[PDB]
């Protein structure tokens, strides 16, 4: 398991999860399993935020697309949430102070090579 880097980084998650629980589409401690399931009866472009299963990441974005349900790791490094970077990514990954602000940004961006479709959240 990875412990927090600094006091700032901890207080960051407190506010990240607070604003996440208030958001309504935050599904706590849900694995990648229900993600491929709950987003099956949802249109392509429906998404949710869940707790990552990996010890390296706090949260993870799951989104239903045409190819199927795809999941996205959300790294927190130095107090900024960003999506995981691709080697073929020419443009740098956007950083954000709030985890919610990361979502709104993505609502062109592609995913290995279908586009990134963020439309509707999944209420909890």
């Amino acid at each position: 398991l990875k412990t927090f880097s600094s006091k700032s980084e901890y207080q960051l998650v407190v506010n990240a999860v607070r604003k996440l629980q208030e958001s309504g589409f935050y599904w706590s401690a849900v694995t990648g399993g229900e993600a491929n399931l709950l987003l099956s009866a949802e249109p392509a472009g429906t998404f949710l935020i869940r707790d990552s299963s990996d010890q390296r990441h706090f949260f993870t974005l799951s989104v239903k697309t045409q190819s199927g349900t795809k999941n996205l790791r959300i790294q927190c490094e130095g107090g900024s949430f960003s999506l995981q970077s691709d080697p073929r990514s020419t443009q740098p990954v956007p950083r954000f102070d709030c985890v919610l602000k990361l979502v709104h940004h993505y609502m062109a961006y592609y995913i290995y090579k279908i586009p990134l479709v963020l439309s509707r959240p999944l209420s909890s």
Partner: peptide
């Protein structure tokens, strides 16, 4: 699980 990365 099905994970992917975002290309810009």
């Amino acid at each position: 699980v099905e994970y992917s990365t975002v290309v810009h």
